[PDB]
Ligand binder design. Structure first.
Ligand SMILES: *C/C=C(C)/C=C/C=C(C)/C=C/C1=C(C)CCCC1(C)C
Length: 227
């Protein structure tokens, strides 16, 4: 098939795989129960991403959606990855600041809406309606980020500075990275079709790897994970 974006797909597979392994290797040596909690969640995240980059590298997770007078190439495997990796990353942040169950439930629930409406949008055939779903998915994301910035940060204040300072770094990387996804979608293949798929795949790989392995490295090399 030889598509232009495959090299970016091979590179995402490689980074996710390696990252996952190292997390698994480091996770199975630790004995602290709480540290175990965090290690298992954080290793699972790039492990799911790896299997999906792999499938996409191999020709799966792609569909031609008609709109704008074109047969548009939409990588839906992406949302199958994010459906489970985005709430797991949220879970990691919540366990860190001892968020309440209702908060977690409501954050995981807003995240299901975001990915769900996002995919519906990336699958929608009436061009302008693609942006209506996109708009709702983004409002869901702004809800989640509001909660991470205003709620959590506040709770990380009952924690010790080492823990509060690790959370603020992960919160910052998360707000910066997640903010970028909706803009990539908008000017890329699912949206305006301004940025081509190969470049678009590159941006998504950089955001995904940063948000999973980048995030994981920061979290797991910290002392805040300990019970
Ligand atoms: C490992 C993956 C991460 C941290 C993915 C984050 C993905 C997002 C924040 C995605 C957001 C989207 C929107 C706000 C609207 C349009 C569609 C999405 C799903 C790309």
């Amino acid at each position: 098939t030889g598509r232009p974006e495959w090299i970016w797909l091979a590179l995402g597979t490689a980074l996710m795989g390696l990252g996952s392994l190292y997390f698994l290797v480091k996770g199975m040596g630790v004995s602290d129960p709480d540290a175990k909690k965090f290690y298992a969640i954080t290793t699972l995240v790039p492990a799911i991403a790896f299997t999906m980059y792999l499938s996409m590298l191999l020709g799966y997770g792609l569909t031609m959606v008609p709109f704008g007078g074109e047969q548009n190439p939409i990588y839906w495997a992406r949302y199958a990855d994010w459906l489970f990796t985005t709430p797991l990353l949220l879970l990691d942040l919540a366990l860190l600041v001892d968020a309440d169950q209702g908060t977690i439930l409501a954050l995981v629930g807003a995240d299901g809406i975001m990915i769900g409406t996002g995919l519906v949008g990336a699958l929608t055939k009436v061009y302008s309606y693609r942006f209506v779903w996109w708009a709702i998915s983004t409002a869901a994301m702004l809800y989640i980020l509001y909660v991470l910035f205003f709620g959590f940060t506040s709770k990380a204040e009952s924690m010790r500075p080492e823990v509060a300072s690790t959370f603020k770094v992960l919160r910052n990387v998360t707000v910066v990275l997640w903010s970028a996804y909706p803009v990539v979608w908008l000017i890329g293949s699912e949206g305006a079709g301004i940025v081509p798929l190969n470049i678009e795949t590159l941006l998504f790989m950089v955001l995904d790897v940063s948000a999973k392995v980048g995030f994981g490295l920061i979290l797991l090399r910290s002392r805040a994970i300990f019970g």
